[PDB]
Amino acid sequence: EDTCIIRISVEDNNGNMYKSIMLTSQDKTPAVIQRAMSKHNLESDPAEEYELVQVISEDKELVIPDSANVFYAMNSQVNFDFILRKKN
């Protein structure tokens, strides 16, 4: 129970996949941002250098780090896929 695949690619490329581990069910903020970035070896922290966007469905998208698992707080929604890219 409580399980979802979380993917994170902070390096352009609209196809190249980076992360996608279905951890138990709890992770997102800088903690997860490091598992996908610090892991491979690309940009770090989605602060201002670059931004991300968690696509869900209907109307539920997140952006910028500090996302404290914003999702299980009250429920869930299909799988989790976050795409990040450089910025200013």
From Swiss-Prot:
Q: Domain Ras-associating spans what residues? A: 2-88
Question: What does this protein do, in the record's words?
Answer: Probable guanine nucleotide exchange factor.
Complexes and interactors: Interacts with Ras.
Q: What is this protein called?
A: Ral guanine nucleotide dissociation stimulator-like 1
**Organism from which the protein derives:** Mus musculus (Mouse)
